[PDB]
Write a protein that binds this ligand. Structure first.
Ligand SMILES: [Zn+2]
Ligand SMILES: [Zn+2]
Ligand SMILES: [Zn+2]
Lengths: 187, 89, 36, 112, 158, 644, 124, 108, 112, 63, 113, 104
């Protein structure tokens, strides 16, 4: 199954065609986790970020309710390898989730946390990018909305120290225009 | 620049390399090898053991005189090992 | 451009293929010899 | 100067790079360019001598490359004047870029 | 049991090391890593000589307040007694090495550094202690106590 | 140093004739005096440059007349006088017409030829003075080529075949430029230099040379002293030893300073090298000169002295032993007490001496030398290792030395310290090592040496493998393969194949090596053939241009062995298999192929050829167009063998 | 040395954990057959097994040199490139030959190519 | 950090026959104090000059910036002047007096 | 940024910190490090000369727009070959269409 | 005296990798091929020799 | 004579262990730790703990400036003079080796034609 | 002086590493610096040769009576590759006008 996916995806122009080629084959559904695990790995492992492999993962979600679930899971599966993956492929990912999350395939984030406690310098960069991409689409205002209604905590709190780590860290990223309220809270 | 040494002819046999192999020394010819070459160990010694009488490579054979130079008796003069008018090495 | 200008001989490659200097620091005292 | 002459000579060499047996005139061109590598200062002085003097050149061959729609003119010059002109061109563009002759709106530009 | 062995060892610098590594004599105050001339730093500022930053020197003989010359700092400089020192000074009180003026990068900024001249040096008639770079600002004055001369600094403007 | 201030007479010394000194002002001169102070002062002051846009004569000079082949941008300084076109109004016209030099230096080959003759026949006319005045600067030029140098050397020769009494004032003025030719990396440059100094010294007079070259003996720099010594060597070859003897014999006894005696002794040496075998008659007088330096208080003189004895004895190959006689007893004594280079030098001398002694006296004396020889294997000095190496050759290559003593005392340290990857990478150490090992084999026998060095055929580096390979080659060349046992022979053939299977460069050593090994083994090699020729075919493919030619040649040299043992299938193989490659487009391969066919023809006869000649020969016929050389060579050869 | 193949953690663990007789499949070549021929992969296999049979853990040192070297769940042996494979192969040949000559008191630079091939491949 | 062949003397050419030593001293006087300067007054050597400075690095900066530098319509030929060649027109002598002086004054 | 951090650290940059972007960018950043880079710094207007090569030379250049020496190589097709062989069934299946088993080569790993 | 320079500039390992000038790739001739930058396999890519034997390194590093 | 012969002999231990390369010995020591990894980690893959922290981070020593690259990458000692004294064979040897890599590629480019 | 020409025959011929003649030793740190200037001392040569490594202990030969250097030192580093680097690199060096020699 894993090999057939690759060949179907490498064959097809567009992102539309690979899904048609893939669905058409009517490969067994439960595997609908690992398949998608395949797509996330197959391009992300692939050398540079390309728009195609990210779109495919998402459509594959809208067509069946599970595919969406299959993805959100696979995003979780990252925690274990947030440190482990080498510092290129984070450049493919950060954006690559950026494009599922700008286009609504946000609150699944919340699971992600900012602490010197446990964050991988890997993970640090991962999330770093993720915002420096998703911003560049929503443009830091619609992002103001999405956050303000988000209730993302492990990211956004207690822990005045961790509010220095948070807010400071978003001065480092550079956006730091959604860190205001927290600045007030420091005070 | 290139001329004979003409030291006294000894009993040492002449030695020619690959290149010069067939040539009779003085007549420059390949015809009728008959008699044998003799040069002094002053000309042939050491690094010159089995050295070419001409170019300075290892001798693979022995030079034979023609019949032409035989009757004109030139083979009896001084040792015909060519010396360049610098040293011989 | 100024960054590529910050990033800013082959004849001296092919010309030096002709002849050579060949020599050490000991021999170059030759250059200090006046005529007679 | 050596820089420029080198560039131009490479450029000329690039047309023949595949190099089948070519022909006589082309042979003259390779041999003469090859000459220019060995004794560059000679070539440079000869060139500057032309540029200071000769006002009369030899006849240029012409032929048409066929694109099946619109034909493309193609010119052929004797090698000497090709090396001379080539160096003239690398030089002119170099000085030109240094002095900011061409304003930015002219864009078959090196940058992009 | 006074001196067990008459020689022992050193573990110390050699005169030929520090000698060969700095020679005009051997000098002190080797330029730090930062030092860069001021004109090229006005080239990275994109400044032609009109709007460029050039530090001109101004002389006043300490007894009589003007120009014996006027000096550019743009072309570090070794302030010393006169031959070794580039910025030679006729002052008889200056040690063979008096001081140095190095432009450094922190921006292209002027700096004055005393070499620990025996007398010292006064800045705005207020001395500075040896062995640290002290930034200078325009209109500041150089001559430790009352000094045959005075000096002033000017940026080129107006 | 060269920056020391100068004086107006010194100023008038440098520049040539016809120039004036100027003050423009006294004031601009005062600007030049303040300039030093103002090089600091006015550089710290206001300054800048700018340009304005305005519309716009251009003079210049190449060398025009008719042609005048081109001038490098520097050579102008020399040839500037030719550039000006003022013409047709005495000596100034001879210097002006002498620029035919320029035609010799740069231009087309014909211009160089015709120019060269024209200046040859004008020698007697122009005289040596103007020529050398206009040459020696060029041959002194810092930018001088290789070729240009050599050509100016040629013109100096050709003009010095004519001018005889004329050159007397210029002799030193010549040698100063020429002596650097004697010490050079190029060999042909050296034989040329020796030749032209020969022509100069013989051309000039003896007293001219002598009286000329004295002041260079005590010159501060040792360079001029050295190259000057080789100069005296050349002139002494010219005018003979006995004529120049009293000069030398006077020099080595000079009581002023040691440097002189050092020079003169070096002269004795370079005479030894140059004259070589021909030293023989005056050997006694020469020794009687040099002997007094061995005991001198200075060290150099002692060292270079004993070295010169070495060179003598080496050119003295055995004769004149008693002439060295009085020299010995001090030397042996010195052998005890010395540390460092001088010791090794003595070992060099004594080394070349021992073959010249009597096997009885040299028995004792030798047995004494062996001790120190042993002890001194271990020094890091490479000069040391060279000396003690060649020594071990001569001492232990003596007929009056016992095998077992060498086998025990010497061989284990010998292969320990001497066989290492420091040596083989060097050239001289490589060769000399080869020779010494060869001779040790010549005494102790074959199976020992080879048996110890076989395991190194499989060592990583090439040059090392090359070394042991050529060593095995020469050994089995002399002693013969009969001594070799069975197992060591398995390690042999496997070693030789293995080493042969990895070839970084193309060279004969591996090939001649293999061939000699096999032809020496005779038919003891027969069980090994199928492995050989299997390797021969598989390699006979590989990747083309590198190894095809080499495997082919391997067949060529292994032909007779593949014949006499009567393996006919193998001759079928090589016959038609090689027959098939005759369509190979790479010439350097095809040549080796035809060669292999040739060698196969000389073993199996005409009517038994597995590729019957009816097939073969017309298949050869079209190849004769093939241009590139080796093909034409081997091809025509084979067409010759079959056609005959 | 098909016996030493069960010294691998995965196989021995599987068998010791097995509660019923059952047939299981594996691919010992992993994905190798993509870049290489069958038989050559067979040589690499024999090298790996034998090497596991002699020094065991030290062969594991070769096969697990850098913690940045990983093995995928679908595969028995770590993922390596062809250069890496040639190197580790040389190292394994070194393990086998060195220990054989250490047992038999033979200088193993002196063995032949035929002998080495035999020793590695099987009984001589 | 210098090539050895360059020397304190520079041969300078492509000069006019009218040219003034005022322009000479002025222009060349940028790089350092002039040791002195000669100019060919003779039929062949007219148009050529030699410049000599108190220091070599002076001349180095000179040929650096003065390379192909312009005067009137002309681009001057600027080369580092050779050595030896024609020298012996003068002699080695007059060392005795000065050496006797340094042996007298300082006594060394 | 990598230049600025290197400046403040005074330590010059290595290969690895640039291994990320090595092949990326329209100038193809690696082209800074070309050995001959000097010479190319003095070449100007190359892009237009390529446009007018069609008149000087008979043959038709499709690549006229760029040049690998100034702009680098803007594509890497190395994958396309591997994926091609995969789609055809791998090496062996392809060889099953050939004479390879005729040549009696032990393996195809050494086909040259 | 340290040997100092303004800024840092760049290392060396890379600062001289790819050829120079060279120019694109022929006028644009068909005959050229040249599409691929590296060879297919590692057979000729991987090493000059697939096999060299020895225990030299072995019995040295062994101990 | 026990303590004295152990001054000379235990100095044979001291200068013997020192002779070779104290730097070299520690690297050898690390391998010994590796053997320990083998006993517990027979065939490690991925998430097992050493790999975990492993990818979870990605005695004076000389301070000033930078030390030019050394094939073997060794920082200079504490009090090192801070000046490059060399024949430059490292760079050129360093540069030349790099040049060859370019050569193998431009060698290939040849092959397709 | 002979060293540098051995490194040129080693680089020119494509020796390729481990067959290098620094593999001659593998057992030895201590290096030999001869032709050294007499004014030099411990701390100095330590400061210059700690460049390519960390030098553990050096014994410089200084004549026992007069107590001045005989002109050479045997040095010992902490690392061998420092020795390989030092012999292959620091050789043919100018110090105080005189070119030092190094070797294993
Ligand atoms: Zn003779
Ligand atoms: Zn010959
Ligand atoms: Zn004859």
């Amino acid at each position: 199954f894993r090999r057939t996916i690759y060949l179907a995806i490498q064959s097809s122009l567009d992102f539309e065609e690979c899904a048609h080629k893939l669905l058409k084959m009517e490969f067994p559904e439960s595997q609908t986790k690992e398949l998608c695990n395949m797509i996330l790995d197959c391009c992300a492992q692939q050398r540079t970020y390309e728009k195609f492999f990210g779109l495919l993962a998402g459509r594959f979600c809208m067509l069946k309710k599970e595919y969406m679930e299959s993805f959100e899971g696979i995003f979780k599966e990252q925690y274990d390898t947030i440190h482990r993956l080498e510092t290129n492929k984070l450049r493919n990912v950060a954006k690559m989730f950026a494009h599922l999350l700008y286009t609504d395939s946000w609150s699944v984030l919340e699971c992600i946390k900012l602490s010197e406690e446990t964050t991988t310098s890997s993970s640090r960069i991962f999330v770093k990018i993720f915002f420096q991409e998703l911003c560049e689409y929503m443009g830091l205002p619609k992002l103001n909305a999405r956050l303000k209604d988000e209730t993302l905590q492990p990211f956004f709190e207690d822990n005045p120290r961790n509010t220095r780590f948070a807010i400071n860290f978003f001065t480092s990223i550079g956006l730091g225009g959604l860190t205001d309220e927290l600045r007030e809270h420091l005070k | 620049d290139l001329i004979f040494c003409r030291k006294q002819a000894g009993v040492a046999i002449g030695r020619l390399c690959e290149k010069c192999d067939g040539k009779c020394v003085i007549c420059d010819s390949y015809v009728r090898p008959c008699t044998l070459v003799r040069i002094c160990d002053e000309c042939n010694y050491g690094s010159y053991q089995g050295r070419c009488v001409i170019c300075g490579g290892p001798g693979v054979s022995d030079a034979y005189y023609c019949k032409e130079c035989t009757i004109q008796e030139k083979d009896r003069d001084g040792c015909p090992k060519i010396v360049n008018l610098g040293s011989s090495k | 451009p100024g960054y590529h200008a910050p990033v800013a001989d082959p004849f001296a490659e092919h010309r030096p293929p002709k002849i050579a200097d060949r020599e050490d620091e000991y021999k170059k005292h030759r250059r200090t010899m006046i005529i007679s | 100067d050596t820089k420029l002459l080198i560039l131009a000579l490479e450029r000329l060499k690039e047309a023949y790079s595949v190099k089948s047996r070519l022909n006589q005139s082309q042979r003259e061109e390779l041999g003469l360019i090859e000459q220019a590598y060995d004794n560059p200062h000679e070539a440079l002085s000869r060139i500057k001598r032309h540029l200071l003097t000769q006002r009369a050149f030899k006849e240029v061959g012409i032929e048409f490359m066929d694109l099946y729609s619109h034909l493309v003119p193609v010119y052929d010059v004797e090698p000497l004047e090709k090396i001379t002109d080539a160096y003239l061109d690398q030089y002119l563009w170099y000085e030109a870029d240094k002095r900011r002759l061409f304003p930015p709106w002219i864009k078959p530009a090196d940058t992009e | 049991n006074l001196q067990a062995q008459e020689e022992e060892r050193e573990f110390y610098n050699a005169r030929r090391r520090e000698h060969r590594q700095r020679n005009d004599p051997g000098g002190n105050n080797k330029e730090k890593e930062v030092p860069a001339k001021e004109k090229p730093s006005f080239e990275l500022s994109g400044a032609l000589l009109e709007d460029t930053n050039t530090f001109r020197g101004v002389v006043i003989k300490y007894s009589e307040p003007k120009r014996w010359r006027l000096y550019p700092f743009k072309n570090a400089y070794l302030l010393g007694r006169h031959p070794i020192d580039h910025p030679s000074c006729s002052k008889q009180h200056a040690v063979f090495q008096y001081r140095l003026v190095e432009y450094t990068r922190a921006r292209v900024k002027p700096y004055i550094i005393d070499l620990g001249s025996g007398n010292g040096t006064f800045l705005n008639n207020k001395r500075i202690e040896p062995q640290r770079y002290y930034e200078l600002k325009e209109k500041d004055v150089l001559k430790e106590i009352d000094d045959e001369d005075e000096e002033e600094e000017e940026e080129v403007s107006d | 140093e060269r920056n020391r201030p100068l004086s107006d007479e010194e100023l008038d010394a440098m520049f040539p004739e016809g120039y004036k000194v100027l003050p423009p002002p006294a004031g601009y001169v005062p600007i030049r005096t303040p300039a030093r102070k103002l090089t600091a002062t006015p550089t710290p002051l206001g300054g800048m440059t700018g340009f304005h846009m305005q519309t716009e004569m251009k003079s210049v000079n190449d060398q025009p007349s008719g042609n005048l082949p081109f001038l490098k941008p520097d050579d102008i300084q020399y040839f500037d006088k030719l550039l000006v076109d003022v013409d047709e109004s005495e000596e100034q016209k001879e210097r002006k017409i002498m620029k035919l030099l320029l035609k010799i230096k740069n231009g087309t080959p014909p211009m160089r030829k015709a120019a060269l003759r024209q200046i040859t026949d004008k020698a007697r006319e122009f005289g040596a003075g103007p020529l050398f005045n206009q040459i020696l600067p060029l041959l002194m030029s810092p930018t001088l080529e290789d070729q240009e140098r050599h050509l100016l050397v040629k013109v100096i020769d050709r003009i010095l075949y004519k001018l005889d009494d004329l050159v007397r004032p210029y002799v030193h003025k010549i040698l100063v430029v020429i002596e650097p030719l004697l010490i050079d990396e190029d060999y042909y440059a050296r034989v040329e230099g020796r030749e032209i100094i020969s022509n100069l010294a013989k051309a000039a007079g003896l007293a001219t040379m002598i009286s000329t070259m004295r002041p260079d003996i005590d010159n501060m720099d040792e360079y001029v002293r050295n190259t000057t010594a080789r100069a005296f060597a050349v002139v002494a070859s010219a005018l003979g030893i006995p004529s120049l003897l009293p000069f030398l014999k006077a020099v080595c006894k000079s009581k002023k300073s040691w440097q002189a005696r050092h020079t003169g002794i070096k002269i004795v040496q370079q005479i030894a090298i140059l004259m070589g075998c021909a030293i023989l008659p005056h050997l006694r007088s020469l020794v009687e000169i040099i002997e007094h330096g061995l005991v001198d208080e200075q060290q150099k003189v002692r060292t270079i002295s004993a070295l010169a004895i070495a060179a003598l004895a080496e050119a003295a190959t055995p004769y004149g032993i008693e002439s060295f006689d009085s020299v010995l007893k001090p030397l042996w004594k010195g052998i005890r007490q010395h540390r460092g280079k001088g010791l090794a030098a003595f070992l060099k001398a004594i080394g070349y001496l021992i073959p010249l002694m009597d096997a009885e006296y040299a028995n004792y004396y030798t047995r004494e030398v062996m001790l120190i020889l042993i002890r001194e294997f271990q020094s890091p000095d490479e000069e040391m290792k060279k000396i003690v190496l060649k020594v071990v050759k001569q001492c232990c290559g003596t007929d009056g030395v016992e095998a077992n003593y060498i086998k025990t005392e010497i061989l284990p340290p010998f292969f320990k310290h001497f066989w290492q990857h420091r040596m083989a990478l060097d050239r001289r150490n490589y060769r000399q090592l080869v020779d010494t090992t060869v001779e040790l084999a010549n005494k102790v026998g074959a199976a020992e040496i080879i048996s110890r060095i076989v395991d190194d055929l499989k060592d990583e580096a090439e040059q090392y493998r090359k070394m042991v390979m050529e060593t095995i080659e020469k050994i089995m060349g002399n002693l013969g393969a009969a001594d070799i046992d069975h197992k060591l022979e398995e390690q042999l053939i496997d070693g030789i194949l293995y080493a042969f299977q990895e070839q970084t460069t193309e060279d004969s050593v591996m090939l001649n090596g293999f061939g000699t090994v096999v032809n020496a083994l005779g038919k003891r090699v027969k069980p090994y053939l199928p492995q050989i020729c299997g390797t021969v075919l598989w390699r006979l493919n590989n990747k083309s241009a590198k190894v095809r030619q080499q495997a082919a040649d391997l067949i060529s040299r292994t032909a007779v062995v593949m014949k006499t043992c009567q393996e006919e299938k193998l001759m079928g193989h090589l016959g038609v298999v090689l027959y098939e490659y005759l369509g190979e487009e790479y010439p350097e391969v095809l040549g080796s192929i035809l060669g292999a066919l040739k060698a196969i023809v000389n073993v199996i006869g005409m009517h038994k050829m597995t590729p019957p000649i009816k097939d073969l020969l017309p298949r050869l016929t079209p190849i004769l167009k093939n241009r590139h050389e080796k093909v034409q060579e081997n091809c025509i050869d084979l067409v010759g063998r079959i056609a005959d | 040395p098909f016996q030493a193949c069960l010294k691998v953690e995965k196989f021995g663990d599987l068998i010791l954990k097995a509660t019923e007789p059952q047939m299981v499949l594996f691919n010992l070549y992993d994905d190798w057959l993509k870049t290489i021929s069958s038989y050559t992969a067979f040589s690499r296999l024999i090298l790996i097994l034998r090497a596991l049979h002699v020094n065991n853990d030290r062969a594991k040192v070769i096969l697990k040199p850098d913690k940045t070297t990983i093995t995928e769940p679908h595969h028995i042996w770590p993922t390596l490139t062809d250069e890496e494979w040639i190197k580790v192969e040389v190292q394994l040949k070194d393990l086998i030959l060195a220990d054989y000559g250490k047992k038999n008191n033979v200088n193993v630079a002196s063995l032949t190519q035929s002998e080495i091939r035999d020793i590695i491949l099987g009984m001589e | 950090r210098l090539p050895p062949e360059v020397n304190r003397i520079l041969y300078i050419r492509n000069l006019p026959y009218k040219i003034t030593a005022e322009e000479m001293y002025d222009i060349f006087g940028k790089y350092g104090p002039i040791r002195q300067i000669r100019v060919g007054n003779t039929p062949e050597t007219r148009g050529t000059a030699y410049v000599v400075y108190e220091d070599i690095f002076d001349a180095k900066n000179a040929c650096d910036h003065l390379s192909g530098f312009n005067v009137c319509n002309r681009y001057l030929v600027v080369l580092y002047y050779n050595a030896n060649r024609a020298f012996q027109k003068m002699d080695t002598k007059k060392k005795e007096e000065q050496l006797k002086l340094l042996k007298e004054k300082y006594g060394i | 940024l990598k230049r600025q951090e290197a400046i403040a650290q005074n330590r010059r940059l290595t290969l690895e910190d640039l291994e990320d972007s090595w092949d990326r960018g329209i100038p193809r950043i690696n082209t800074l490090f070309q050995k001959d880079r000097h010479t190319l710094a003095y070449d100007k207007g190359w892009r237009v000369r390529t446009d007018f090569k069609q008149y000087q030379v008979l043959k038709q250049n499709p690549f006229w727009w760029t040049h690998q020496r100034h702009d680098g190589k803007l594509w890497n097709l190395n994958n396309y070959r591997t994926d091609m062989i995969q789609a055809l069934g791998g090496v062996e299946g392809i060889l099953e269409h050939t004479l390879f088993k005729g040549t009696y080569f032990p393996t195809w790993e050494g086909l040259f | 005296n340290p040997r100092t320079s303004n800024e840092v500039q760049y290392d060396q390992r890379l600062f001289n990798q790819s050829k120079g000038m060279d120019s694109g790739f022929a006028g644009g001739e068909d005959e050229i091929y040249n599409v691929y930058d590296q060879a297919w396999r590692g057979g000729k890519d991987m090493a000059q020799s697939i096999y060299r034997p020895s225990k030299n390194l072995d019995k040295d590093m062994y101990g | 004579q026990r303590r004295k012969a152990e001054k000379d002999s235990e100095r044979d231990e001291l200068y013997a262990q020192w002779g070779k390369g104290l730097a070299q010995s520690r690297q050898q020591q690390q391998n010994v730790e590796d053997a320990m990894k083998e006993m517990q980690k027979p065939l490690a893959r991925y998430i097992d703990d050493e790999d975990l922290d492993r990818m979870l981070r990605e005695r004076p020593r000389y301070s000033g400036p930078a030390p030019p690259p050394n094939r073997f990458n060794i920082w200079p000692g504490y009090r090192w003079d801070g000046v490059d004294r060399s024949n430059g064979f490292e760079q050129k040897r360093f540069a030349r080796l790099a040049s060859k890599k370019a050569v193998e590629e431009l060698a290939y480019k040849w092959s397709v034609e | 002086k002979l060293i540098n020409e051995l490194n040129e025959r080693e680089v020119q011929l494509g020796v390729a590493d481990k067959v290098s003649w620094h593999s001659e030793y593998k057992d030895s740190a201590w290096i030999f610096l001869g032709g050294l200037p007499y004014e030099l001392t411990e701390g100095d040569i330590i400061c210059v040769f700690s460049q390519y490594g960390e030098i553990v202990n050096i014994n410089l030969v200084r004549d026992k009576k007069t107590g001045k250097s005989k002109g050479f030192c045997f040095l010992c580093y902490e690392d061998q590759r420092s020795t390989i680097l030092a012999v292959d690199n620091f050789n043919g060096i100018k110090i105080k006008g005189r070119t030092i020699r190094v070797d294993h």
